[PDB]
Scaffold this active site. Structure first.
Site, PDB file in Angstrom:
ATOM      1  N   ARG A  84       0.711  -1.255   0.037  1.00  0.00           N
ATOM      2  CA  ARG A  84      -0.267  -0.142   0.085  1.00  0.00           C
ATOM      3  C   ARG A  84       0.272   1.218  -0.200  1.00  0.00           C
ATOM      4  O   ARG A  84       1.875   0.920   0.986  1.00  0.00           O
ATOM      5  CB  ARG A  84      -0.981   0.237   1.662  1.00  0.00           C
ATOM      6  N   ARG A  93      -6.616   1.661  -3.090  1.00  0.00           N
ATOM      7  CA  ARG A  93      -5.431   0.810  -2.064  1.00  0.00           C
ATOM      8  C   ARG A  93      -5.499  -0.515  -2.641  1.00  0.00           C
ATOM      9  O   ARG A  93      -6.820  -0.993  -2.743  1.00  0.00           O
ATOM     10  CB  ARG A  93      -5.911   0.865  -0.733  1.00  0.00           C
ATOM     11  N   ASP A  96      -6.517  -2.353   2.944  1.00  0.00           N
ATOM     12  CA  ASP A  96      -6.681  -1.711   3.192  1.00  0.00           C
ATOM     13  C   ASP A  96      -7.142  -3.199   4.782  1.00  0.00           C
ATOM     14  O   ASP A  96      -7.839  -3.586   4.793  1.00  0.00           O
ATOM     15  CB  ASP A  96      -8.387  -0.842   3.696  1.00  0.00           C
ATOM     16  N   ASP A  98      -9.247  -2.517   8.443  1.00  0.00           N
ATOM     17  CA  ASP A  98      -9.127  -1.790   9.701  1.00  0.00           C
ATOM     18  C   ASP A  98      -9.951  -2.281  11.305  1.00  0.00           C
ATOM     19  O   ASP A  98     -10.311  -3.244  11.047  1.00  0.00           O
ATOM     20  CB  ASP A  98     -11.057  -0.755   9.231  1.00  0.00           C
TER      21      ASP A  98
HETATM   22  N1  LIG Z   1     -10.658   1.565  13.890  1.00  0.00           N
HETATM   23  C1  LIG Z   1      -9.704   1.510  12.921  1.00  0.00           C
HETATM   24  N2  LIG Z   1      -8.927   0.879  12.196  1.00  0.00           N
HETATM   25  C2  LIG Z   1      -7.972   0.718  11.982  1.00  0.00           C
HETATM   26  N3  LIG Z   1      -7.427   2.341  11.020  1.00  0.00           N
HETATM   27  C3  LIG Z   1      -7.293   3.410  11.965  1.00  0.00           C
HETATM   28  C4  LIG Z   1      -9.455   2.966  12.536  1.00  0.00           C
HETATM   29  N4  LIG Z   1      -9.146   4.136  13.714  1.00  0.00           N
HETATM   30  C5  LIG Z   1      -8.532   5.198  13.725  1.00  0.00           C
HETATM   31  N5  LIG Z   1      -7.651   4.682  12.632  1.00  0.00           N
HETATM   32  C6  LIG Z   1      -6.700   5.777  11.840  1.00  0.00           C
HETATM   33  O1  LIG Z   1      -6.882   5.512  10.321  1.00  0.00           O
HETATM   34  C7  LIG Z   1      -5.608   6.128   9.659  1.00  0.00           C
HETATM   35  C8  LIG Z   1      -5.960   5.746   8.344  1.00  0.00           C
HETATM   36  O2  LIG Z   1      -6.259   4.983   7.687  1.00  0.00           O
HETATM   37  P1  LIG Z   1      -6.805   4.314   6.624  1.00  0.00           P
HETATM   38  O3  LIG Z   1      -6.803   3.315   6.107  1.00  0.00           O
HETATM   39  O4  LIG Z   1      -5.764   5.767   5.227  1.00  0.00           O
HETATM   40  C9  LIG Z   1      -8.347   4.686   6.708  1.00  0.00           C
HETATM   41  P2  LIG Z   1      -9.693   4.125   5.708  1.00  0.00           P
HETATM   42  O5  LIG Z   1      -9.753   3.043   5.997  1.00  0.00           O
HETATM   43  O6  LIG Z   1      -9.233   4.767   4.193  1.00  0.00           O
HETATM   44  O7  LIG Z   1     -11.065   4.780   6.229  1.00  0.00           O
HETATM   45  P3  LIG Z   1     -11.966   3.727   6.785  1.00  0.00           P
HETATM   46  O8  LIG Z   1     -10.813   3.700   8.396  1.00  0.00           O
HETATM   47  O9  LIG Z   1     -13.269   5.215   7.724  1.00  0.00           O
HETATM   48  O10 LIG Z   1     -12.578   2.829   6.424  1.00  0.00           O
HETATM   49  C10 LIG Z   1      -4.740   4.381  10.526  1.00  0.00           C
HETATM   50  O11 LIG Z   1      -3.616   4.884  10.962  1.00  0.00           O
HETATM   51  C11 LIG Z   1      -5.383   5.061  11.941  1.00  0.00           C
HETATM   52  O12 LIG Z   1      -4.788   5.608  13.049  1.00  0.00           O
HETATM   53  N1  LIG Z   2     -16.520  -0.657  -1.133  1.00  0.00           N
HETATM   54  C1  LIG Z   2     -16.183   0.612  -0.460  1.00  0.00           C
HETATM   55  N2  LIG Z   2     -16.042   1.457  -0.418  1.00  0.00           N
HETATM   56  C2  LIG Z   2     -15.215   1.984   0.080  1.00  0.00           C
HETATM   57  N3  LIG Z   2     -14.973   3.571   0.853  1.00  0.00           N
HETATM   58  C3  LIG Z   2     -13.340   3.535   1.629  1.00  0.00           C
HETATM   59  S1  LIG Z   2     -13.050   5.267   2.064  1.00  0.00           S
HETATM   60  C4  LIG Z   2     -13.791   4.737   3.606  1.00  0.00           C
HETATM   61  C5  LIG Z   2     -15.502   4.960   3.427  1.00  0.00           C
HETATM   62  O1  LIG Z   2     -15.796   4.296   3.687  1.00  0.00           O
HETATM   63  C6  LIG Z   2     -16.403   6.295   3.471  1.00  0.00           C
HETATM   64  C7  LIG Z   2     -17.603   6.455   2.974  1.00  0.00           C
HETATM   65  C8  LIG Z   2     -18.389   7.652   3.043  1.00  0.00           C
HETATM   66  C9  LIG Z   2     -18.266   9.062   2.390  1.00  0.00           C
HETATM   67 BR1  LIG Z   2     -17.915  10.485   2.771  1.00  0.00          BR
HETATM   68  C10 LIG Z   2     -16.003   9.063   2.686  1.00  0.00           C
HETATM   69  C11 LIG Z   2     -14.823   7.687   3.175  1.00  0.00           C
HETATM   70  N4  LIG Z   2     -13.387   2.195   1.597  1.00  0.00           N
HETATM   71  C12 LIG Z   2     -14.081   0.969   1.042  1.00  0.00           C
HETATM   72  C13 LIG Z   2     -13.774  -0.006   1.112  1.00  0.00           C
HETATM   73  O2  LIG Z   2     -13.836  -1.329   1.942  1.00  0.00           O
HETATM   74  N5  LIG Z   2     -14.790  -0.886   0.193  1.00  0.00           N
HETATM   75 MG   LIG Z   3      -7.903   1.554   6.937  1.00  0.00          MG
HETATM   76 MG   LIG Z   4     -11.504   1.435   5.341  1.00  0.00          MG
END
Ligand SMILES: Nc1ncnc2c1ncn2[C@@H]1O[C@H](COP(=O)(O)CP(=O)(O)OP(=O)(O)O)[C@@H](O)[C@H]1O
Ligand SMILES: Nc1nc2[nH]c(SCC(=O)c3ccc(Br)cc3)nc2c(=O)[nH]1
Ligand SMILES: [Mg+2]
Ligand SMILES: [Mg+2]
Length: 158
Positions: A84, A93, A96, A98
């Site tokens: 990534r 990406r 991811d 989470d």
């Molecule tokens: N429950 C969680 N799991 C993973 N990352 C988290 C988290 N809560 C906050 N974060 C933070 O999110 C930061 C950015 O990660 P990203 O993977 O780029 C966001 P994303 O997964 O695209 O959005 P999302 O977390 O809304 O799904 C991580 O470095 C972490 O500090």
């Molecule tokens: N289907 C699918 N869509 C995704 N979009 C993202 S970015 C976080 C997000 O959901 C998001 C949702 C609404 C707003 Br406004 C901004 C971010 N991650 C995923 C994933 O894992 N699956």
């Molecule tokens: Mg994430």
């Molecule tokens: Mg995510």
């Protein structure tokens, strides 16, 4: 003592299924994490920034002796292992990882919120999560996953 946690995995770049499979293997190989359940994989329309590739998403159950912060480090390291490079939260990406749930505990640090604070309005999470954790209580809402899940035609069995 083992904590039961739930992780949400996503990939929308390249060979998505391979990247998710490798991520599961890597997570399982860390000392202090065992993957104990794997959901079906769903192909999901991108949410938020809609003009990027379709995702594959799934959820996994783990049993872990790691702290929530150590778990987060492992999740981030696994994304690095899967190359990534993109870090725009809105953008695509290769992987991811989470943290969705960490036992029944709740924390809202500036950069780590668990339960994941956006999970309850995301079918790409709740659908695969309900497949493996229907009776698990989501601590913020105090509702079981099966009572949060909703129909979403943009989430398709893969
Ligand atoms: N429950 C969680 N799991 C993973 N990352 C988290 C988290 N809560 C906050 N974060 C933070 O999110 C930061 C950015 O990660 P990203 O993977 O780029 C966001 P994303 O997964 O695209 O959005 P999302 O977390 O809304 O799904 C991580 O470095 C972490 O500090
Ligand atoms: N289907 C699918 N869509 C995704 N979009 C993202 S970015 C976080 C997000 O959901 C998001 C949702 C609404 C707003 Br406004 C901004 C971010 N991650 C995923 C994933 O894992 N699956
Ligand atoms: Mg994430
Ligand atoms: Mg995510």
């Amino acid at each position: 003592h083992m904590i039961q946690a739930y992780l949400g995995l996503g990939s929308n770049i390249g060979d998505r299924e391979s990247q998710l499979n490798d991520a599961i293997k890597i997570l399982n190989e860390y000392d202090g994490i065992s993957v104990s359940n794997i959901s079906p994989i769903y192909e999901t329309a991108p949410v938020g920034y809609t003009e990027q590739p379709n995702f594959l998403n799934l959820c996994v159950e783990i049993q872990t002796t790691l702290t929530v912060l150590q778990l987060l480090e492992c999740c981030l390291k696994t994304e690095e292992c899967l190359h990534r490079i993109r870090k725009e939260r809105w953008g695509p990406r290769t992987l991811d990882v989470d943290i969705l749930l960490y036992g029944e505990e709740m924390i809202d640090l500036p950069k780590l919120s668990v339960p994941h604070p956006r999970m309850n309005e995301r079918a790409f999470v709740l659908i695969p999560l309900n497949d493996i954790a229907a009776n698990v209580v989501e601590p913020r809402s105090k509702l079981k996953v099966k009572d949060l899940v909703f129909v979403d035609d943009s989430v398709k069995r893969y």
